[PDB]
TrEMBL record, chain C:
Modified residues annotated as N6,N6-dimethyllysine in this record: 15, 119, 170, 191, 247
Full-protein interval shown: 11 to 274 of 573
Protein name: Uncharacterized protein
Organism: Legionella pneumophila subsp. pneumophila (strain Philadelphia 1 / ATCC 33152 / DSM 7513)
UniProtKB/TrEMBL annotation, chain D:
Transmembrane helix found in the keyword field: yes
UniProt name for this protein: V-type proton ATPase subunit D
Tree of life domain: Eukaryota
Species annotation: Rattus norvegicus
Main subcellular location of this protein, as a coarse class: membrane
TrEMBL record, chain E:
Membrane topology (UniProt): Peripheral membrane protein
GO biological process: ATP metabolic process; homeostatic process
Swiss-Prot/TrEMBL catalytic activity: ATP + H2O + 4 H(+)(in) = ADP + phosphate + 5 H(+)(out)
Native organism taxonomy: Eukaryota, Metazoa, Chordata, Craniata, Vertebrata
Protein name as annotated: V-type proton ATPase catalytic subunit A
Chief location bin: membrane
Pfam family, one: ATP-synt_ab_Xtn
Recorded GO CC terms: clathrin-coated vesicle membrane; proton-transporting V-type ATPase, V1 domain
CDD domains: ATP-synt_V_A-type_alpha_C (cd18111), ATP-synt_V_A-type_alpha_N (cd18119), V_A-ATPase_A (cd01134)
Binding site for ADP: 237-242, 264, 429, 506, 508
Signal sequence residues: none
Native source organism of the sequence: Rattus norvegicus (Rat)
Ranges of residues in domain ATP synthase A/B type C-terminal: 447-546
Length: 460, 23, 264, 47, 600, 250
């Protein structure tokens, strides 16, 4: 049932070593036990047991170890691991990375106490992603449509507007509407101004009733940055798999998480793996991301968008590389579109929603969607090639068809990819904009589309 | 990697020796 | 290829004990004298009531025959004769045929590569399917055809290219593979088999009288729906006095169907 | 000879990826030039 | 028996009173029985790499040893099962727990107990009879297809003291009792085998028979032998399912094993959703392919050791079926994901990196796995042959084969069906790039083709040459246009087009191409190359003549034969008898011979 | 012949002793029994992998690509157990074989082997893909002892000169092939086109040979001259005027 037995409290700090506090004479410590330290002045500091050996408990303290000493410091041991106080009332609310509230509301009245670490979703019970989530952005919803239960990152780079994109997805996201959908938004490693941006932007624009927001600031404890995704997913598992919700879990910078996992690894004195990150990051990252999908006999399904700042703009870096191995696809923010002031600067060409063929078509959206998206992709690819050709040969050397792919290219970036931060577009409105662009070409030039789809939708 | 690993092994030896020196 | 020495000698004494079990099982009376002589060197170590340890010491000591390649070849020849003699279960073959087929296998290069083994594998598939077969036209047809095949194999062996046996494999395995809803094709194949046999009564005494009647009834039952006239259905019903499946019964059913095809 | 011999560093990996995208872009731009010239050249020959 | 936890740091659990413990022994840690392997001993102490998350393990917790290294339960009740990489039964975990989650520290017995299986004892056996490892002491009817041969474990031997009579028995009932050196062994249907040990054989035979896929390119131009080692560049854009589903529905292997090496969560559920719904025709009945397979599935967040073990589990299952005299096919759908799991273990063991950050022993761990394929004479006395074929996919980043898992795999596998996104984008299914792809088994299969398809080796050689000539001629077409080629070369492009468009392509969703028998495959290629030889003779016979044969004359006077050469793909072994199919092929040979004879 | 087989699934530490056992047998047969021994060591790459695995397990100081820093000495302890010895009619020849990982000649396995061994014989995909069996590429190949195991009493007088001129013509043939790949054959001189035609005729006749076809050195040199006769006599800049006068017209 519950821990009926009282907590021991130890003054027996044998030492301090950076963020570690080394207790000794400890009775039967647990690995990953939560502990509550008190400084000599009476100030509380929270910590977690990072290692155990015989009588010794190595506590990683969350805040710095400033003020800790070998005599007056006292450490209370909670007898248990960290359990999230989960509930549905976490929707409409904002929490710090530890799960303490920061919206002036009360502490969470837990519907359950769930271990943050989760468990593997039994592969026999997992169900294939088979309906759409609208993200509101046309460069996603019309081109890279996300299936409910898909995992798909937004790769970005330092200084690109991926937070404004993630904020827009948090505002606009929902079911197709041919009541029970929720965002969970883990904001890891966010500077103070950006945390105020998310908090303000979701509070202002009506969204809060369908989002749970976790903020971990850039200067919050590095171990709370590790807890924050595990806390968010534990909440998303409660909302999806117990409360039957559809859930979209947004993680705001996995790079800042990798740069945290590196610290916890260095704290255990583990030797660094490839490029200075822990070799086991593939599993830890998977253990985050795979807390996703629909499940047998339930309506609930966690969809996920791990936003990820590619270090040095480079896809070969282990952070994007491992994310591309675990997640079903990727979406790219592009510095070129950003410099062109195209917002949202999502580049359609290297992007791929791996699952999109089961999010879209008859019954799920509209029968034309795949045909439209293929033809738009082809016309944008040919348009980019013809735009490069114009720059080589001059406009006089272009055919009439080249001028169509080039006029399409200009109108496509200005109407399809461009959207602005608060314009919300359905899948249906995105397809009708898609047709307004495809109508530029002769019916016969739309080669990837079937003649039935052209006969039903080429007319305007 | 090899230098950091050999350092880590020497530290573990020094810790074990330092505990043995208490006897 | 290789093994631990304890494994290697354990396999030797295994193969000796298995050759003995096969030899006793193929022949409980010791009639197969020429065959038994070609195993006397291994049979003695099982006919003597030796413990597994005692034969294992004799194997390590080189007193038992201990070449696993020779034992595997010799064991293989024996069990593939045992499969022949066991496969034909309702029709025990003559001793001279058994020693003849043994000599042909002993003379062959490699029994796994031999068409002898291919024919027995095709018989095994067909026979094994019958062991749990529910009552249905295809299954009754295969029971009948397999019984003829077992008899003819017990009359001519496996190595003889008897055209009837070779066709009975081709037709049997086709009817086995043929999908269970394909009733008209099952009927047509079974009819085609009886039409092509030399005998006017290919199944006569091959199988139980109840099964012979089931074959006759089955051939009649799928013809009756083709008749638009009750008088022609009564002429076809009068043919159900027959019990043995015959080419003449098939021709009679066809004659009644052809007479209705004229009378429309 | 066979290599540029910039000294191994993450800087040099970035610079060599940039030089590769530069050279590959140059190839594509000049391939369009060669194709357009080839078309006109064959048209003129028939004329 | 059990030791006690002395310390924990991440997944590393040090235990004490472990003086009786062994290297790589399998241990249950904590009150929740978390799995782990002993990676070091240091006295009466053992260091255990715990697989599952150790959060909540405490000093002084029990540490229960299993008397075994990491091992697979083998026995009846494998067919239809779904396993994780360490043989835990994912279907039964689901049905007992009624949870969407694997609970940390499952102890569910891998083969389901309490199911009384129908057992028939091997009727030759008696009390006092001699027996050796791999002897089939009885048969279990676990499913309609796969009669399960129960066999003596490879290390057990002696005299039968008892055998159970015909009846119904579950995996814990003692079916056999035997004695050796005065010591009795009681024995069950369940058999435990160390997963990293090769199940021994009488002899690994040279592989000599095709593993027919029912797919024209795969069976004609790049054949894999029964017992063969092969790879596929499994990636989304190439359509990898075209091979794996075709093998699963049609191929001439009695049993199949799947290993999910460490696949993406949703891609894993595609496998687990799809296979139950697939079916095979057997003896004119239709049955689910789950009657003849087991799916060792693992999502990317399964424990690292389970992903690294998963490949060895699938082959250890496949070797048990091989020892039953079955031909197994084993699919391994991303050897790269397994190599990542291996790299993570090495990283956690703080071992030094080698090529691209992989461990030194990656080459050995790959090679010692692919060498577990092949045909065999089994252990034990009924002399039976069997095999495992290993179809281990690779996933080189950006297609770059210099990736060490990919390079070491291509250094070992004898066949490589190089699927290509450029062909898949054009819907050229089965999407195999014939320039990239290869097979080393051609020589070894000559015996089979000489016996059964004696003209086919010439045809295969000519086909590969015609395709290579198409790629060489395409450079001349790009330089100076098709009009500039010789007549021989123009007809070579036309036949290469027929080969590429209607021989090598095969749309498996169509009723006529669901499967393609080897005789149909030979007959098609025989007609295309017969046309090539007759056209080439007509051209070369009229070389330097006044009137000269050319592709346009052939298309004018016998464009019907070109139409038939395409049309032959539509012939259906279900609706058309073999004689009808062979006769149509023979008629097209006569038709084309008369047609060319009317010209020259 | 004596065979030592360590299979790819046999315990990887046995690979360290496998060639050492073979050599210890070769040393008995040559240095005590005066046999003329040839030792073949197959995939010294699988030996070097066994060194890399053992080195990882031991925690040795790593050299390049994670091989142990002593890989040269250990490879020398294998390879230097070769040669003739005074007072003995015996001899150990060795022809080790190794798979160059990712085809890289600068990889530590070929590279340290290249330092220790008396030249090397190279096999190439650029020959094998064109079906040129045996696919031996002469250009990277050398044999250090060819500078002695040739000439009177051993081989024909011309051998050294023919070899050097064949090397020059094949090397220039590869260089003009690399020019053709940029500027096309229209930029090559008639002399350069003859070196490209030499490279074709050379591969088709000198390198190309049947798997059971046995050719003598004297036959090989007559083939060499029949190829050298493709050029005008004055272009044969590696051959002396006396060797040309004795052998070029014949």
């Amino acid at each position: 049932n519950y821990l009926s037995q009282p907590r021991l409290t130890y003054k027996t700090v044998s030492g301090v070593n950076g963020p570690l506090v080394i207790l000794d004479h400890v009775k039967f410590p647990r690995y990953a036990e939560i502990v509550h330290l008190t400084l000599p002045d009476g100030t509380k500091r929270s910590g977690q047991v990072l290692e155990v050996s015989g009588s010794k408990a190595v506590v990683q303290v969350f805040e710095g170890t400033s003020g800790i000493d070998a005599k007056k410091t006292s450490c209370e041991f909670t007898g248990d691991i960290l359990r999230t106080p989960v509930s549905e009332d976490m929707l409409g609310r904002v929490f710090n990375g530890s799960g303490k509230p920061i919206d002036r509301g009360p502490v969470v009245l837990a519907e359950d106490f769930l271990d943050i670490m989760g468990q593997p979703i039994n592969p026999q019970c997992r169900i294939y992603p088979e309906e759409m989530i609208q993200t509101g952005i046309s460069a996603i919803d019309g081109m890279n449509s996300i299936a409910r239960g898909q995992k798909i990152p937004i790769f970005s780079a330092a200084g690109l507007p991926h937070n404004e994109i993630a904020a827009q997805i948090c505002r606009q996201a929902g079911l197709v509407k041919k009541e029970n959908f929720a965002i969970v938004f883990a904001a890891m490693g966010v500077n103070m101004e950006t945390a105020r941006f998310f908090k303000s932007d979701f509070e202002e624009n009506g969204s809060m009733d369908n989002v749970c927001l976790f903020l971990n600031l850039a200067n919050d404890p590095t171990i709370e940055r590790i807890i924050t995704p595990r806390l968010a997913l534990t909440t998303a598992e409660f909302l999806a798999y117990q409360c039957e919700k559809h859930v979209l879990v947004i993680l705001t910078d996995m790079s800042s998480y990798a740069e945290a996992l590196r610290e916890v690894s260095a704290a255990r004195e583990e030797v660094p793996g490839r490029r200075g990150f822990p070799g086991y990051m593939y599993t830890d990252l998977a253990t985050i991301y795979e807390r996703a999908g629909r499940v047998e006999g339930r309506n609930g399904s966690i969809t996920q968008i791990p936003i990820l700042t590619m270090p040095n703009d480079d896809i070969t870096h282990p952070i994007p590389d491992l994310t591309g191995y675990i997640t079903e696809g990727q979406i790219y923010v592009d510095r070129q579109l950003h410099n062109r002031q195209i917002y949202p600067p999502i580049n359609v060409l290297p992007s791929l929603s791996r699952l999109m063929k089961s999010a879209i078509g008859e019954g799920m959206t509209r029968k034309d969607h795949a045909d439209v998206s293929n033809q738009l992709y082809a016309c944008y690819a040919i348009g980019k090639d013809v735009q490069a050709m114009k720059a080589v040969v001059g406009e006089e050397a272009l055919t009439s068809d080249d001028l169509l792919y080039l006029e399409f290219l200009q109108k496509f970036e200005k109407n399809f990819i461009t959207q602005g931060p608060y314009e919300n577009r359905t899948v249906y409105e995105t397809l009708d904009i898609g047709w307004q662009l495809l109508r530029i070409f002769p019916k016969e030039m739309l080669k990837r589309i079937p003649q039935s789809t052209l006969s039903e939708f080429y007319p305007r | 990697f090899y230098r950091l690993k050999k350092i880590q092994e020497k530290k573990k030896i020094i810790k074990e020796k330092s505990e043995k020196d208490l006897e | 290829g290789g093994l631990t020495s304890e494994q290697y000698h354990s396999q030797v004494v295994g193969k000796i004990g298995y050759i003995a079990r096969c030899m006793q099982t193929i022949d409980p009376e010791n009639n197969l004298k020429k065959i038994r002589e070609d195993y006397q060197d291994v049979l003695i170590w099982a006919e003597k009531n030796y413990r597994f340890e005692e034969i294992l010491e004799a194997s390590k000591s080189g007193k038992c025959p201990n070449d696993l390649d020779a034992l595997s070849r010799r064991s293989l020849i024996l069990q593939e004769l045992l499969r022949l003699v066991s496969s034909i279960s309702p029709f025990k073959m003559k001793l001279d045929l058994i020693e003849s087929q043994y000599e042909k296998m002993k003379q062959h290069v490699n029994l796994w590569k031999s068409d002898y083994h291919v024919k027995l594998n095709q018989l095994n598939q067909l026979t094994d399917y019958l062991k749990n077969a529910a009552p249905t036209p295809k299954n009754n047809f295969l029971r009948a055809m397999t019984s003829v095949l077992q008899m003819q194999i017990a009359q001519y062996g496996i190595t003889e290219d008897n055209e009837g046996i070779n066709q009975l494999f081709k037709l049997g395995l086709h009817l086995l593979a043929m999908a269970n809803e394909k009733i008209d094709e099952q009927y047509h194949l079974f009819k085609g088999y009886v039409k092509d046999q030399p005998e006017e009564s290919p199944f006569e005494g091959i199988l139980p009288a109840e099964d012979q009647k089931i074959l006759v009834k089955t051939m009649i039952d799928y013809a009756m729906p083709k008749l638009s006239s009750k008088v022609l259905q009564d002429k076809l019903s009068a043919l159900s006095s027959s019990d043995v499946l015959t080419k003449t019964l098939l021709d009679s059913i066809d004659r009644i169907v052809k007479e209705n095809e004229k009378l429309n | 000879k066979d290599r540029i011999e910039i000294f191994p560093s993450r800087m040099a990996q970035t610079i060599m990826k940039a030089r590769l995208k530069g050279a590959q872009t140059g190839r594509n731009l000049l391939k369009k030039k060669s194709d357009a010239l080839t078309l006109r050249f064959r048209q003129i020959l028939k004329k | 028996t059990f030791g006690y936890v002395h310390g924990v740091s991440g997944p590393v659990v040090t235990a004490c009173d472990m003086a009786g413990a062994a290297m790589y022994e399998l241990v249950r840690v904590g009150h929740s029985e978390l799995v782990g392997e002993i990676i070091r001993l240091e006295g009466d102490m053992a260091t255990i790499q715990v697989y599952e998350e150790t959060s909540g393990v405490s000093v002084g917790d029990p540490v229960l040893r299993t008397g075994k290294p990491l091992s697979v339960e083998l026995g009846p009740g494998i067919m239809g099962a779904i396993f994780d990489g360490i043989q835990r039964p994912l279907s039964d975990i689901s049905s007992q727990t009624q949870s969407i989650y694997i609970p940390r520290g499952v102890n569910v017995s891998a083969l389901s107990r309490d199911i009384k299986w129908e057992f028939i004892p091997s009727k030759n056996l008696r009390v006092g009879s001699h027996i050796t490892g791999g002897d089939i002491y009885g048969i279990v009817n676990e499913n309609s297809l796969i009669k399960h041969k129960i066999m003596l474990p490879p290390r057990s031997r002696g005299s039968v003291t008892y055998i159970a009579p015909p009846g119904n028995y579950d995996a814990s009932d003692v079916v056999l009792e035997l004695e050796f050196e005065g010591v009795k062994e009681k024995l069950s249907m369940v058999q435990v085998w160390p997963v990293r040990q090769v199940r021994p054989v009488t002899e690994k035979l040279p592989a000599n028979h095709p593993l027919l896929t029912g797919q024209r390119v795969l069976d004609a131009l790049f054949p894999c032998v029964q017992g063969g080692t092969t790879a596929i560049p499994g990636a989304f854009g190439c359509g990898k399912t075209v091979i794996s589903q075709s093998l699963s529905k049609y191929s001439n292997s009695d049993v199949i094993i799947y290993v999910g090496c460490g696949e993406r969560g949703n891609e894993m559920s595609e496998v687990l959703r799809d296979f139950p719904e697939l079916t095979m025709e057997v003896d004119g009945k239709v049955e689910s392919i789950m009657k003849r397979t087991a799916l060792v599935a693992n999502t990317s967040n399964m424990p690292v050791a389970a992903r690294e073990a998963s490949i060895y589990t699938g082959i250890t299952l496949s070797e048990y079926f091989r020892d039953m005299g079955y031909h197994v096919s084993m699919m391994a759908d991303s050897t790269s994901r397994w190599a990542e799991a291996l790299r993570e273990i090495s990283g956690r063991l703080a071992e030094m990196p080698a090529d691209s950050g992989y461990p030194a022993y990656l080459g050995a761990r790959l090679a010692s796995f692919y060498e577990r394929a092949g045909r065999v004479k089994c252990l034990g006395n009924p002399e039976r042959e069997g095999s495992v074929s290993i179809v281990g996919a690779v996933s080189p980043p950006g297609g770059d084969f210099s990736d060490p898992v990919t390079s070491a795999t291509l250094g070992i596998v004898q066949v490589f069906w190089g699927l290509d996104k450029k062909l898949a984008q054009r819907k050229h299914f089965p999407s195999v790039n014939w320039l990239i792809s290869y097979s080393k088994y051609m020589r070894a299969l000559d015996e089979y083709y000489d016996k059964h398809f004696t003209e086919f080796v010439p045809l295969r050689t000519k086909a590969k040459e015609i395709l290579q000539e198409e790629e060489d001629l395409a450079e001349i077409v790009q330089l100076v246009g098709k009009a500039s080629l010789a007549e021989t070369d123009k007809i070579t492009l036309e036949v290469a087009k027929l080969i590429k468009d209607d021989f090598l392509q095969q749309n498996g969703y169509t009723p006529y191409d669901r499967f393609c028998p080897f005789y149909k495959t030979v007959g098609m290629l025989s007609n295309m190359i017969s046309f090539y030889d007759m056209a080439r003779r007509a051209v070369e016979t009229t070389a330097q003549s006044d009137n000269k044969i050319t592709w346009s004359i052939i298309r004018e006077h016998m464009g019907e034969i070109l139409y038939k050469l395409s049309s032959m793909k539509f012939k259906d072994p279900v609706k058309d008898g073999e004689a009808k199919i062979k006769a149509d092929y023979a008629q097209l040979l006569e038709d084309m011979q008369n047609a060319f004879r009317s010209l020259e």
